[PDB]
C-alpha cells in the first residue's frame, strides 16, 4: 500500500554526467559513448544571451575551446557540432558506464524523472510531468543547465529532457536530446512566458483508479456521464477535454477495479462540482494530475483491495 | 526556483542491492564489503510469522540454506549471524561497488530517501519523513522487504532504514541497519498498530522559510508570539510542541530571510487558526511537514528573492 511520486533509480544516468566549460561558463553535459551533449548556451556570455547568433559564436570556437571533466578526469574534445539547441562534443574516450539508451520526445501529460546536477555532480532526483503548456514544475538553481530527464524501461534509459531555462513564473523549459525545445521557447532573452496551463484530465482519472486499487471508494457515485457532457464540465474547470483515446487508455485500470471509465468520469464531475468535503484521496486534499495511467500500473498492486 | 520532494541520487545504493532466498521466501538484501544484510523474517514461513522463535528457526539453518544472488551471479554464503531483527550473511566476495558508508539511526521528523526494490532489482526512489509515531508513509508491495532508506553526505552513504512490514493503516515500519526497530513494533503477527501521529512543527516552519526564500510573503503578519503561547495553539491543532532547540536550529533560515523564528511562529499560528483562504504556499494548499531545515538549505537558493 501507499502511493508516492516515485522517480526511476538514477544510477545509470549518474554515470553519464560530466562538466562542460567554455570560457567562464560551466554547466552539465551528458556523456554517452564518445559524445557529450550540452546546452548550446554554454558558448554565450551574459550579454550574448539577449541576441546571440549561435552559428557565429560557434564558428569562433575550436575543439580546445571546450573543457570536459568527468569526475577528476579531463576528456579531450576532438570534434564539435551544433544540433538545434544543443552541442554535440566528440571526445577521446567512450564512456565505459554508457547504459543501453534511446532518445525520446515525450508528449504533454507524460512524466519523467529529473536528475538535478551541478558542476557535473548529481544532487537530487524527482519526478515531473510535462505540462500541457510544455513547461515542467522543476526545482533548479544557477548551474543546473544540462541536467537531464529520463525514464527507464527494463534496463534501457530513455532520455527525454535537457534543462535550459527558467520562466518568470518559476517553471522550467528545456529540450529533447535532439535539442528541440518543448513548447514555443527559445534559448535567448525575450519576454517569453509560459502559456496558460490546464489540468491533465487523464492523469486525474488514473489517480482516482489508483485510489480504488488501494482500497478507497468514497468519491464514487451512482451516476454515469457521456463524454460530451463530461467535457462541458471540464471546460468550466480548466481541465483538458477527455477523448475516446483517453477512455481506451484507461481500459486496464477500469478492468482491474470494475469501474467503467465514464462512471469514473461521473465521479470526477461530482468532485469538481462539489469539492472533496474535507476528505482526502490517497492522502491528498486536491485532485492530483502528475501520475499517468502507466505510473499507476507501475506502482500499484495488480490486485485491487476490494 | 521551484521546490520539490527531492531524493538523493540512488546509484551508490543500487550497486548494493541483492536477492536473498531461504526456502521459498525471497526478499532483498544489502551487500556491503563481504556482508549481506536482510530482514530476519526471510527464515520464516507464513505460519511461523504468528509466533516465530528466531533463535530456534536460525539454529536449524546452515550457510548453504541461504542463496544470495547479485545480478546474475551467485554469492556463496560462508557465515551467518543474527543481529536484532536482521541477519548478517558473510559471503565469499566483497562488493566491488561498496561506497563509503555509515550506519545511522535517524531521529523522528528527519527525512531520507527510499530505494524501493523487488527481487534484488531497484524499482523506484522517493523521499520519506520518519513520522513522530515511528512509521513512514512509503509505497511498498509484496517482495519489497529489505529495501533500504539512506541519506548521502558528500560521497558517503548513511544507511538509516531497512523495510520489514506494513501496518493496518497502510503505513510502513522497519529497522535501522543494526536491526533495531523504529518504534515499538516487532517482526511477528500481532494486532500492532501505528500510534497517534503528530504534525512535525519544525518542518512546517522550515518550509515556510523555503517559501519566503523563493519569494512569497503573503502569510506573514505584524504579530509575534511567545514560545508558550504558540504551544497552546500547537496542542489544539495536533502539532508537536516547539522547543528552544527547534528555535536555534532555525537560526540560519531566519538569518537568510530576516524573519525572527517567533515571528514566523506567529504567522503559523494565524494559518492554523484562519486557514489559507484558498491560497497556496509553494504550490501546496496545505501545510507541508516532510521537509527539514536541512532539506530546505540543501534545495533552496542561498539568496532570498527579496
Ligand atoms: C542554467 C544555466 C545558468 O545557471 O546560467 C547562469 C544563470 C540556468 C537554469 C536556471 C537558473 C535558475 N533556475 C533555472 O532553471 N539557465 C539560465 O540561467 C538561462 C540562460 C538562458 C536560457 C534561455 C534564454 C535566456 C537565458 N536563463 C534563464 O533561465 O533566465 C531566467 C532566470 C535566470 C536566473 C534565475 C531565475 C530566472
Ligand atoms: C515484505 C516481505 C513480503 O513481501 O512477504 C510476503 C507478503 C513485506 C512488505 C509489506 C508487503 C505489503 N506492503 C509491505 O510493506 N512484509 C510483510 O509482508 C510482513 C511480514 C511481517 C513482518 C512483521 C510482522 C508480521 C509479518 N507482513 C506484513 O507486513 O503484514 C501486513 C501486510 C501484508 C501484506 C499486505 C498488506 C499488509
In CATH terms, what is the fold-level topology of the largest domain in chain A? Answer: Thrombin, subunit H
CATH architecture of the largest domain in chain A: Beta Barrel
| Ligand list | the ligand *[C@@H](CC(=O)OCC)[C@H](C[C@@H]1CCNC1=O)NC(=O)[C@H](Cc1ccccc1)NC(=O)OCc1ccccc1
User: What share of residues are in beta strands of chain A?
Assistant: 25-35%
CATH class annotation of the largest domain in chain A: Mainly Beta
CATH superfamily of the largest domain in chain A: Trypsin-like serine proteases
Structural class of chain A: alpha+beta
Largest sheet of chain A: 7 strands, antiparallel
- Please give the order of strands in the largest beta sheet of chain A: 5-4-1-2-3-7-6
Number of continuous helical runs of chain A: 8
Number of domains of chain A: 3
Q: What is the helix fraction of residues of chain A, given as a range?
A: 10-25%
Task: Name the biggest interface.
Answer: A-B, 38 and 38 residues
